[PDB]
């Protein structure tokens, strides 16, 4: 082990939601993301596992099949947070289009381009001076067609 | 700090008068107004961005051309300083320069102008689907802006002819109310993001995420103070640490979108807190002289640099030293019937007409030491059979002439495609490892001359040179080489170093072996007791021996009758003689013309061949040695023009004025005999010994022996190391060199002039015994004719 | 695979029109969907009634094969000769996750379609 190097920032989601398994579907299969730091890698690297059957591991202490592995490891870098990175990893995998795609793809490059739809349906809100609560709510028209974007062709 | 109004403005044309201008796109005052088709302004939103746009700003933004406190008051400067940095930068081209400042230049349209022009559609600049804020915010100001408000105009445009997308972020010293661009406040920031059409890149986004970026009060402020790119770069990492991405989920919209608040207000916290045959006669002669004529301009105006001037200082005194020297020996084997004057006055007059003429200037010619021994061994003969040498000789050069016209109308200088990089790599490297042998002989030669004693006597007779062995000479001269060589590595390596200011650094490694030559012919200068060899040059333009011979040499016989059958007879060495300067001169522009050496003005092989042939033929005539394209010479010559890149060669400078310069000094050598009479011999083996371990740096063959000693595992990546086995490598490396053992045991021979088959035999030792041994793929790699990947 | 590898047409049409897509969209297999997309089969083929392999997907509740289908150029929106689009038959037999993606395409505005089965058995 070690302790990181570089700064510790506490988790957003643990500061916002944390501080204060019966809805799982019958046939649904479990999909495991296991992020680590290791100083001794050159680079991060990525790694995506689908089974031919859904087996089920040790890992996962429920009783749903793994069927998709996401792997990623690598050294302490700049603006590279594994827990969030694991995060958008999982986000990605809980998106429809997305699994469904991970579901039928034979190669890397269909997964890349399930990707690149995702990030081009992917709304993202720059930081501003004065949350009113009601601009945000001017979004919802543009939330509602980047999903008829992601949903469609 | 100022409240910021933000202007998003675009390239466009109109249709009623199709004329190129900037249109309003958006604004931003405290949320983001679009402006939509029919002219009217849209719901004010919050500034939504997509993921490639604050992408894409970033890469540019790495990258950008940043101006802070700019001292302008009007658009057309800002334009021009901005355009200006864009070509220090290097983002830009100059040539796109004007068209970009006619772009920047043009009028600004506005949301009140849009009808009066009959609609306005988007355009893209030559060099000569509708928005999503439009389709969900525009289908159905002054009192706004605070009074101490500043605003910022970003300039968004798509020009085809720009290689890569650029940006310019621009800051002025004092807010100014430009005459171009209306705005009810005045302008201090101006983005300007051009670029080409890409992948990932709507240039509407990316002026969307700009005004965002530039709304941002903590970017605003940071813009305000900010003093270098860096801080620039480093508030907008802040701003994208802050920034929240929403992906695409079934959530409803409302509750969706509320769920950020929470995570919005804690993110906020602390932030705010040539050898083709053509079949025709004289064909390759004549596309010789159309490739390379056309450049004769710039081969007299490419040589106004002092690196030509260096070159020139070099190559002097590499040529006239073999040339002294070889002629010395000349008239010692040949009874001065030839010698030094000749030999000079024959290496000036043909590197005069070479230089002038060629198809490739960059050529050294002069007398080698195979021609030497051709030389010696005829006049033995001549001297055996009782033939007059000289006429004989004129007898050779007469069937010289015939040889190459006819060599010349046939095209036979295409032969020379059948020499790949084996064969030339294998000469090149065994006349190198021969240079450098006999300049260490030489050396060799002062030690034994005046060995190490206990005693000397100190009356011994110098005249014409030292009749005993005399103190101090061979240990200075040792000293004077290595000295000499040394201060040349030094500089050359201080060339490419990082000291001293670059254009003063590259002037002084371009003079490092005329600077060396100086400071060590300076420290034997002053040195008054110790005897050192110097050069020696004769007293007048005169033939060497005036009771032998005049300057022209009669075909019929000087004191008897020429026989009729040895004129006949004389082709035999003709052909020797041919063979031997094909050879030696062909191999030589091969070396010096490889694709790899950057020579982007083209050579001539069958110009060339033709004009040292037939020139050696005609000094044969006056009693002057026929003459050769010597390879390290000439090597040399090329190496000393070739520029470096910022490790890569970038260009040479091709002219004919430094070869031409050479040759002219050449012949001037016996005027200046007080110059060259303080210069030593042994600072000009210094010079031959860089001259040498310079000349194996282009070889391929040299690259691989060093490999013979290195692990694999510090291997370079190349397609000969990378595709084929280390010891199949190593296995056609020693081929090789078995061939270089046996061209060094013929040269050691009396039968050193069959050299020239010895080698051309490697022609068929590569073209049919190692395929037999190699696959097809580990040839292409080893022995490649420009060093590609197979 | 071998039937495609052999020269067999993928549009093939029963006596009431339907396609390998339709029926591979009606039983739910994905996987057959995804090759027959992949070999040209067509998205929007229609019945003689009118109905696309994307009606018959949401009348039987396979939201992935909606998904697949919309995502490979399925047309909501297309009204069958009983005027049925097919989130209207999606909303008719409540499904709510079939209703729930195609709600999302589909722009603002009690026949059932089977295909023919083979009932030979030994």
């Not at chain 1, 429809?96 to 039928?104: E, G, L, P, Q, S």
């Not at chain 2, 190198?432 to 260490?440: D, K, P």
Request: hydrophobic share 45%; net charge neutral; proline share 6%.
């Amino acid at each position: 082990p070690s302790q990181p190097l570089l700064p510790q920032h506490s988790s957003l989601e643990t500061q916002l939601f944390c501080e204060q398994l019966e809805k799982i579907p019958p046939d649904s299969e479990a999909t495991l993301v296991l992020v680590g730091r290791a100083d001794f890698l050159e680079q991060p690297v990525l790694g995506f596992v689908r089974l031919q059957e859904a087996a089920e591991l040790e890992a996962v202490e429920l009783p749903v099949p793994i069927r998709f592995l996401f792997v990623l490891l690598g050294p302490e870098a700049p603006h590279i947070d594994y827990t969030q990175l694991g995060r958008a990893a999982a986000t990605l995998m809980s998106e429809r289009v997305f699994r469904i795609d991970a579901y039928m793809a034979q190669s890397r490059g269909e997964l890349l381009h399930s990707l690149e739809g995702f990030l081009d349906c992917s709304l993202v809100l720059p930081p501003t001076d004065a949350p009113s609560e009601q601009a945000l709510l001017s979004l919802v028209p543009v939330q509602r067609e980047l999903l008829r974007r992601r949903y469609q062709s | 700090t100022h409240k910021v109004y933000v202007e998003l403005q675009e390239l466009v044309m109109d249709e009623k008068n199709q004329e190129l201008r900037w249109m309003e796109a958006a604004r931003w005052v405290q949320l983001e107004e679009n402006l939509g088709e029919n002219g009217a302004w849209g719901r004010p939103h919050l500034s939504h961005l997509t993921f490639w746009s604050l992408l894409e700003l970033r890469r540019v933004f790495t990258k950008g051309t940043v101006l802070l406190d700019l001292q302008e008051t009007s658009l057309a400067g800002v334009a021009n300083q901005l355009l200006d940095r864009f070509i220090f930068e290097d983002q830009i081209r100059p040539q796109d320069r004007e068209e970009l400042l006619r772009a920047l230049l043009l009028k600004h349209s506005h949301a009140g102008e849009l009808e009066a022009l009959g609609g306005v559609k988007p355009a893209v600049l030559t060099r000569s689907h509708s928005s999503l804020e439009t389709q969900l915010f525009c289908e159905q100001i002054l009192e706004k802006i605070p009074p101490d408000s500043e605003a910022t105009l970003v300039l968004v445009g798509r020009a085809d002819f720009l290689e890569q997308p650029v940006l310019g972020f621009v800051r002025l010293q004092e807010a100014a109310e430009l005459e171009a661009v209306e705005l009810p406040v005045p302008i201090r920031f101006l983005f300007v993001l051009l670029g080409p059409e890409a992948p990932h890149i709507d240039y509407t986004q990316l002026g969307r995420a700009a005004a965002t970026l530039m709304s941002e009060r903590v970017f605003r402020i940071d813009a305000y103070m900010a003093q270098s790119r860096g801080e620039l770069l480093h508030s907008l990492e802040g701003f994208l640490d802050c920034s929240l991405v929403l992906p695409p989920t079934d959530a409803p919209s409302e509750q969706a979108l509320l769920s950020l608040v929470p995570v919005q207000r804690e993110l906020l916290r602390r932030r705010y807190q040539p050898l083709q045959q053509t079949g025709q006669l004289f064909g390759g002669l004549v596309r010789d002289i159309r490739r390379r004529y056309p450049y004769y301009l710039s081969d007299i105006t490419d040589a106004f640099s002092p690196q030509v001037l260096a070159a020139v200082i070099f190559i002097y005194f590499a040529a006239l030293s073999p040339a002294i020297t070889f002629g010395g020996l000349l008239g010692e084997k040949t009874r001065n019937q030839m010698g030094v004057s000749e030999l000079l006055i024959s290496t000036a007059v043909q590197g005069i007409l070479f230089a002038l003429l060629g198809a490739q200037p960059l050529l050294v010619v002069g007398f080698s030491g195979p021609l030497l021994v051709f030389e010696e061994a005829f006049f033995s003969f001549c001297e055996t059979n009782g033939l007059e040498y000289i006429v004989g000789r004129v007898w050779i050069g007469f069937w010289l002439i015939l040889l190459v016209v006819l060599v010349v109308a046939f095209e036979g200088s295409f032969l020379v495609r059948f020499i790949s990089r084996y064969t030339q790599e294998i000469f090149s490297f065994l006349i190198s490892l021969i240079f450098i042998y006999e300049t260490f002989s030489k050396l060799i030669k002062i030690f034994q001359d005046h060995p190490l004693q206990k005693t000397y006597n100190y009356n011994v007779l110098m005249v014409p040179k030292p009749q005993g062995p005399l103190p101090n000479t061979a240990l200075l001269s040792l000293v004077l080489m290595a000295g000499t060589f040394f201060f040349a590595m030094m500089l050359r390596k201080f060339k490419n170093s990082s000291y001293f200011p670059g254009k003063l650094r590259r002037v002084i490694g371009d003079f490092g072996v005329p600077i060396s030559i100086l400071i060590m012919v300076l420290v034997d200068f002053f040195i008054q007791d110790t005897y050192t060899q110097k050069l020696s040059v004769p007293d007048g333009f005169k033939v060497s021996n005036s009771s032998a011979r005049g300057w022209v040499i009669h075909p019929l016989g000087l004191r008897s009758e020429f026989p009729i059958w040895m004129m006949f007879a004389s082709a035999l060495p003709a052909l020797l003689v041919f063979i031997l300067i094909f050879l030696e001169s062909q191999i030589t522009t091969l070396i010096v013309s490889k694709p790899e050496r950057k020579m982007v003005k083209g050579s001539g092989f069958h110009l060339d061949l033709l004009l040292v042939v037939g020139m050696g033929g005609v000094a044969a005539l006056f009693g002057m040695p026929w003459l050769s394209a010597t390879t390290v010479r000439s090597v040399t010559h090329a190496n000393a023009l070739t520029v470096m890149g910022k490790a890569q060669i970038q260009e040479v400078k091709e002219q004919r004025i430094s070869g031409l310069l050479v040759a002219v000094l050449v012949g001037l050598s016996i005027l200046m005999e007080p110059i060259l009479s303080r210069i030593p011999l042994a600072v000009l083996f210094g010079i031959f010994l860089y001259m040498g371990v310079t000349s194996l740096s282009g070889i391929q063959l040299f690259d691989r022996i060093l490999l013979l000693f290195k692990p694999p595992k510090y291997h370079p990546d190349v397609p000969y190391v990378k595709r084929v086995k280390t010891w199949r490598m190593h296995l056609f490396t020693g081929i090789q060199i078995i061939c270089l053992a046996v061209l060094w045991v013929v040269k050691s021979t009396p039968a050193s002039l069959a050299l020239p088959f010895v080698l051309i035999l490697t022609v068929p030792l590569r073209r049919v015994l190692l395929p037999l041994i190699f696959r097809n793929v580990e040839l292409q790699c080893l022995d490649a004719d420009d060093a590609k990947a197979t | 695979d071998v039937l495609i590898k052999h020269g067999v047409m993928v549009d093939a049409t029963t006596r009431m029109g339907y396609t390998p897509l339709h029926v591979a969209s009606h039983y739910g297999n994905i996987k057959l969907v995804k090759f027959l997309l992949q070999h040209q089969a067509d998205v929007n083929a229609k019945t003689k009634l009118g109905y696309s392999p994307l009606h018959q997907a949401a009348q039987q509740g396979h939201t992935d094969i909606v998904t697949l289908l919309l995502k490979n150029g399925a047309s909501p929106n297309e009204v069958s000769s009983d005027g049925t689009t097919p989130l209207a038959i999606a909303k008719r037999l409540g499904y709510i996750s079939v209703t729930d993606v195609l709600k999302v395409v589909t722009d603002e505005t009690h026949r059932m379609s089977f295909p023919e089965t083979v009932d030979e058995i030994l």
